[PDB]
């Protein structure tokens, strides 16, 4: 009569454990490299009813795993092409005055130097055009010369974003919530599990999310401790706001041989007019989008507070300005026009003067760098604005007329908007159950 | 009547059903512990090896563990070990058909090593009696 124990194998059990995931890409490149195992186009998602699960945003190891993973890919892809050691020679530069707009006066610097040719016993005089943000007076030298010299982006291996699927190994499962009111952390009554996550674009930005996955129904303000101003506030929109970015210059590329089987590509001679790179966003759409953001944001703060917006709080060029990698050419753009408004309780575009820096310093690891060769002709961009990464200003008195400014810029936050749903769990098949059991003794 | 509580509820599907109804879904659980990486440089080379070895090692630990208990080769097996009633003073109907398994393991997770500490001793004993009967 007294109940005994029974051994149960495979019964569903979950334990919070995190390990190394795996990559899968859809049918050379920098992300996939045709190395990740292809994922079958039947992402069988299964809904678990009568269950609730806990999700810890900003503590998920998936965010950390992806951050370290792509950096390894970046280093891997930069090793096999020419280094730029011999480009640190003295630069005798000059201004550009051939059909120059007043807004970009003194930006490009026509330069000449005595960089070496392929033969070790001969020199050559080569002239190239460099942006103001790539040279420094000593007459000129490259900005990165006193820092470790960097390689040149392998011209062929484009950095165009490609969706990447993350799948856990056997014996582990990935759970994703589905409630449309999901906060940063809390139980979700619509738990589901899937072996592989949907396409995640690793596209880069610092202020405005580009090509992100939009929210389901309403604008969501996902944030940990909110009364603390020291942590960023992540906002995800619900209807995309189209963004146009273009480079008007008709640039041309010159190939200069540096050594045996090692070539360097320079800029110029430019053709046509000299016009500043600019981006465009609809005025009507942005005002509506911002109005919706404050409406939801006002539910977490005072209703009578006068919400204001302003540009960044200054600092290094890397974080103070919007960044993206459209068309393989980097743009640093001043977004003071998208935050110049005030909201009180109760014409088709914006001109954003952008900037181009040809020498790129990647993640704040200071020992690395890279060169991006120019691309012939004009470059056009069409992307979607899906959210913002704002920061809360301090010194507020009595919590009235609160304001936010764009900032942050850490790469982890960009993926957090895509990995907040997904968490990794471990399966505990073994188990013991009490019942009235009598083993058949031999 | 094609809809019966069975495998097609999905891998881990029984986690929302009662413990009694989850017994028939224990076969869909053991199958998804090895496969999934059958089809196939440092990055993703060592990672694939590390993931594959860990999955293989993890499954072995349970297969070994069931081997010492003598339940190996039977998905649902039991021994003659009684258990201290103080752990859970509940009836069979009060355990199987009225509560989910997920929160169950949490309550008795404290005595997982203790309850394991009785299974192997009896299995070795059961072998000893068979040896005595054998001789």
């Amino acid at each position, epitope marked *: 009569e007294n109940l005994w124990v029974t051994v149960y194998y495979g019964v569903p059990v979950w334990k919070d454990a995190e390990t190394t995931l795996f990559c899968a890409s859809d049918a050379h490149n920098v992300w996939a490299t045709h190395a990740c195992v292809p994922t079958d186009p039947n992402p069988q998602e299964i809904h678990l009813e009568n269950v609730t699960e806990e999700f810890n945003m900003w503590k998920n190891n998936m965010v950390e795993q992806m951050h370290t993973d792509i950096i390894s890919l970046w280093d891997q892809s930069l090793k096999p092409c020419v280094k730029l050691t011999p480009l640190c020679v003295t630069l005798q530069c000059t201004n550009v005055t051939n059909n120059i707009t007043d807004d970009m006066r003194g930006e490009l610097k026509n330069c000449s130097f005595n960089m070496t040719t392929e033969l070790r016993d001969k020199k050559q005089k080569v002239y190239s055009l460099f942006y103001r943000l790539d040279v420094v007076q000593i007459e000129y030298r490259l900005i990165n010369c006193n820092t470790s010299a960097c390689t040149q982006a392998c011209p062929k291996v484009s950095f165009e974003p490609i969706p990447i699927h993350y799948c856990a190994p056997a014996g582990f499962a990935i759970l994703k919530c589905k409630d449309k009111k999901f906060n940063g952390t809390g139980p979700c009554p619509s738990v589901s599990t899937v072996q592989c996550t949907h396409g995640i674009k690793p596209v880069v930005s610092t202020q405005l999310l580009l090509n992100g996955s939009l929210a389901e129904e309403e604008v969501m303000i996902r944030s940990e401790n909110i009364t603390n101003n020291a942590k960023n506030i992540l906002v995800q929109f619900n209807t995309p706001v189209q963004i146009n970015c273009t480079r008007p210059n008709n640039n041309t590329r010159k190939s200069i041989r540096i050594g045996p089987g090692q070539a360097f590509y320079a800029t110029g001679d430019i053709i046509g007019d000299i016009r500043q790179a600019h981006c465009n966003v609809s005025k009507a759409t942005w005002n509506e989008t911002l109005g919706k953001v404050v409406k939801q944001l006002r539910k977490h703060f005072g209703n009578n507070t006068i919400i204001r917006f302003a540009n960044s709080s200054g600092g290094d060029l890397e974080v103070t300005t919007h960044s993206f990698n459209c068309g393989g050419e980097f743009f640093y753009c001043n977004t003071s026009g998208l935050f110049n408004s005030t909201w009180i309780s109760n014409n088709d575009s914006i001109t954003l003067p952008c900037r181009i820096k040809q020498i790129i310093n990647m993640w704040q690891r200071i020992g690395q760098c890279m060169y991006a060769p120019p691309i012939q002709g004009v470059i056009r961009c069409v992307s979607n604005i899906t959210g913002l990464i704002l920061t809360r200003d301090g010194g507020s008195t009595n919590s009235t007329t609160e304001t936010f400014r764009p900032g942050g810029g850490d790469m982890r936050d960009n993926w957090r908007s895509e990995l907040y749903k997904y968490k990794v769990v471990k399966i505990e098949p073994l188990g013991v159950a009490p019942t009235r059991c009598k083993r058949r003794v031999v | 009547a094609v809809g019966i509580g069975a495998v*097609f509820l999905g891998f881990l599907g029984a986690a929302g059903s009662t413990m009694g109804a989850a017994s028939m879904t224990l076969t869909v659980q053991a199958r998804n512990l090895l496969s999934g990486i059958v089809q196939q440089l440092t990055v993703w080379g060592i990672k694939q090896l590390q993931a594959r070895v860990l999955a293989v090692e993890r499954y072995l630990r349970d297969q070994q563990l069931l081997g010492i208990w003598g339940c190996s080769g039977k998905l649902i097996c039991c021994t003659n070990v009684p258990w201290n009633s103080s752990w859970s003073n509940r009836n069979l109907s009060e355990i199987w058909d009225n509560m989910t398994w997920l929160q169950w393991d949490k309550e008795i997770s404290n005595y997982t090593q203790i309850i394991y500490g009785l299974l192997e001793e009896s299995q070795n004993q059961q072998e000893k009696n068979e040896q005595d009967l054998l001789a």
Partner: antibody
Amino acid sequence: QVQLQQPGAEFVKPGASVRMSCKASGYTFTSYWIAWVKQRPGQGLEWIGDIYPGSGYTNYNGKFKNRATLTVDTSSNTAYMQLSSLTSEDSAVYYCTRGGTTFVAEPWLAYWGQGTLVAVS
Amino acid sequence: DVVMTQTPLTLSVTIGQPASISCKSSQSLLDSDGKTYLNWLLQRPGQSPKRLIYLVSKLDSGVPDRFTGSGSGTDFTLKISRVEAEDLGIYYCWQGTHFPQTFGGGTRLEIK
């Protein structure tokens, strides 16, 4: 009210494909079974298939040798069916009917919709 | 599989008379749980199919007094006391225990 919205009618061409949708509203889509039914005017009702809007498990009739691919969406509460590439004699109306729960299964055929006229020509 | 045949292919009836329709199963449909999930649905001429009897002992909502489902094991029947325009149609006996969930062969009620 438990309703299964269906498209009115689709006119397709030989060698083409169709996206036979079936909207779910007024209930929980993650539990009830979903099955399709044929209503040829000159012939009796025929069993086409069944899709489980949960685990994604799919079952197909023996006579069909897996000629169709069944897909569901738990986010938008919709169900989809591929033919795939049917022919002329199979031009009739298909009904997306809601089944019962995988445990009880007694209320099968509880509710229907209006169907969609598939006329490949 | 278990086939579902019905004797009446054509049933000539005038308004105000009792109608009889029956169905057969090759194998007994008594499920282990102790129930018969057979359904008697009257498909309207061009409208969506509508069930009339489920769990033949039990009856559906909007109960019509004329319809009285009965039968177990191999024999299934549905007796109608009076005929109405709604009664004129096609009845299908649907088994609900084995695979596939085959419907009935169809019995037509028409006035000639």
